[PDB]
A paper describes a structure:
Interestingly, VmoLac was crystallized in two different space groups. The other structure, solved in P622, contains only one protein molecule in the asymmetric unit. The dimer can be reconstructed by symmetry, and the observation of the other neighboring molecules reveals another, weaker interaction within the crystal packing. The contacting surface in this interaction is much smaller (616 Å2) and involves 4 hydrogen bonds and 4 salt bridges. Intriguingly, this contact mode between the two protein molecules connects the two active sites hydrophobic channels. As expected, both of the structures are nearly identical (r.m.s.d for α-carbon atoms (over 315 atoms) of 0.34 Å), but some slight differences can be observed in the active site region (loops 7 and 8). A clear extra density was observed in the active sites of both of the VmoLac structures, although no potential substrates were present in the crystallization conditions. Because of a relatively good resolution of the structures (1.8 and 2.35 Å), this unexpected density could be attributed to a fatty acid with good confidence. Therefore, this density was attributed to the simplest fatty acid that fit the observed density and that was present in the expression host E. coli: myristic acid. The carboxylate of the fatty acid molecule is tightly bound to the bi-metallic active site (2.2 Åα–2.3 Åβ), while the long aliphatic fatty chain that sits in the hydrophobic channel is mainly formed by loop 8 residues.
Residue numbers in the entry:
A (entry chain A), B (entry chain A): 1 to 314
């Protein structure tokens, strides 16, 4: 019976997560830039935008949000504690190393075990000197594919899972075979695929490619609703309805991947280009369209409540 | 007439730097690792090792140390303020972005001007929310050569120099042509080479390669005395004596590049492999050997006092 730490250092367990967004962000920032140039940032605005987004989701029933911000994209327990105390929403945190190409010389010179030990420390003792412990581990691969450093960080995630039993939630890229690289590696390391999510699969509507992942037994992340560049909304909704009609409902997870702040781009170019991206679009637009095509209220609850719960049990 | 900020936010000017080590470190750490895994570090040990090293240099007459730790290797004004208040040694700080391959998506998505503006802010207003201002700018290239991101960061350093007139102190690699890449770029941007240091040239004893840099008019960094892997001590000393006998004394700068902490390696492997590396070796070993081969006390003073002073004037 698993105990899930939440920001603030209380615990809950899989059965009490309730209605959950399994992949979102509160603040996505680049550590080396914020450390060195704090004049480029405004902590009061960042906190306000995050509290606003999380309160909007809370209005539609969200009890638990899983924050996918790990090392390399600005993981910050203390910032998350403030969001949690202001909103009353449970925030689940994780560990891992986010990169598409390289890892730090710190870990290249010491090897895979030093990275595994850092993740195992966050999972068993606490993130960043706190008693909030990581409840999952992340692995990342994108359009550069499987570089050596990427392969190391993915295998480290797999090994931390093997030691601690926390699930693995991933980031992949549908424009190459990266999702299948993740599957191969996890199988080489003995990971039970039912404890993993292959991420960002919602970015494609190619049913045959999706089913080739689903046949391995993993969950899939239909997890960027609202980011149309990628795959427009109408195709994302259509794909989710079709996968449910074809029998796959127990392997589906939904989310928006919302970033109330993301430092990678100026904010104006993001607001102009994906103006519908929020942490509530699944409630305002996706779920009504699914219901009006015959998806049941219970089927929605299975996806948004049971599937996350089951990811975190077994 | 130039004002040089020092850690703590006092100012001095080139004439009062006095006996100077132009390239050293107080603490070299990886921001993303220390931000995310503070359990791997001990701030009290790091501070003590830095205060100890700086007091040892102070015993031999050092008044001013230039800290070459910039963004990407853990630049931290507040840590440096503590070292300064404890030791009474002037600490000069800089700006730039340290990398051998990639720069953050933050700057790739906004372009070279956003990096120039970050450096110009540190030089004219202050580093990290303080009134300690950067007094030089750094540019870096190593064994991967001139990647696109590296080229951007080098040109940004050149442009910040063109706006603000602070000197440029560089890191290069003698095993390829990187030193000459720096020279070409600085010339394309209109930089006066007498306001630059081509770094880590002391890692070679090939007189003909060194003179090809000296002929361009830049200073050179004979700046890793004590790191024998690279080029043993006896050859480094011999090269400095020969360059002075061949007429080059006004273009020579000496230092140890000492890191009281460096997170890239476990400490034991560093202590075992370069056991003589300290912030005092130039005083205990190099200068006596130079004097006993006929280098004058005034020639030593020209190198350790006038050359840094002149780097910072014009
Ligand atoms: C092309 C300029 C504006 C495009 C806006 C796209 C916003 C980028 C979304 C960030 C991708 C999600 C991050 C991640 O979770 O891995
Ligand atoms: C090969 C294992 C131990 C080797 C010890 C070498 C210590 C590395 C020195 C760091 C290089 C200077 C950093 C820099 O200033 O750019
Ligand atoms: Co992602
Ligand atoms: Co994400
Ligand atoms: Co260097
Ligand atoms: Co250095």
């Amino acid at each position: 019976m698993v105990r899930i730490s939440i920001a603030g250092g209380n615990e809950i367990d899989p059965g009490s997560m309730g209605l959950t967004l399994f992949h979102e962000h509160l603040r996505l920032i680049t550590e080396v830039v914020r450390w060195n140039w704090p004049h480029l940032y405004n902590e009061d605005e960042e906190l306000k935008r995050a509290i606003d987004a999380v309160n909007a989701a809370k209005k539609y029933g969200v009890k638990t949000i899983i924050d996918l911000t790990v090392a390399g994209i600005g993981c910050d327990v203390r910032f998350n504690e403030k969001v949690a105390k202001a909103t009353g929403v449970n925030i689940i945190m994780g560990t891992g190393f986010y990169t598409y190409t390289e890892i730090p010389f710190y870990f290249k010179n010491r090897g895979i075990d030093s990275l595994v030990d850092a993740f195992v420390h966050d999972i068993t003792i606490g993130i960043q000197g706190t008693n909030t412990r990581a409840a999952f581990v992340k692995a990342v691969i994108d359009s550069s594919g499987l570089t050596k450093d990427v392969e190391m960080a993915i295998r480290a995630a797999a090994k931390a899972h093997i030691k601690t039993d926390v699930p693995i939630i991933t980031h992949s890229f549908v424009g190459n075979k990266s999702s299948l690289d993740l599957i191969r590696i996890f199988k080489e390391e003995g990971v039970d695929l039912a404890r993993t999510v292959i991420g960002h699969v919602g970015d494609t509507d190619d049913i045959s490619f999706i089913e080739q992942i689903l046949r391995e037994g993993a969950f899939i992340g239909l997890d960027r609703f609202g980011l149309d560049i990628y795959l427009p909304l109408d195709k994302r909704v259509k794909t989710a309805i079709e996968l449910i009609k074809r029998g796959w409902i127990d392997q589906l997870l939904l989310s928006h991947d919302y970033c109330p702040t993301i430092d990678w781009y100026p904010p104006e170019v993001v607001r102009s280009t994906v103006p519908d991206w929020t942490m509530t679009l699944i409630f305002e637009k996706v779920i009504p369209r699914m219901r009006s095509e015959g998806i049941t209220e219970e089927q929605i609850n299975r996806v948004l409540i049971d599937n996350p719960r089951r990811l975190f049990t077994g």
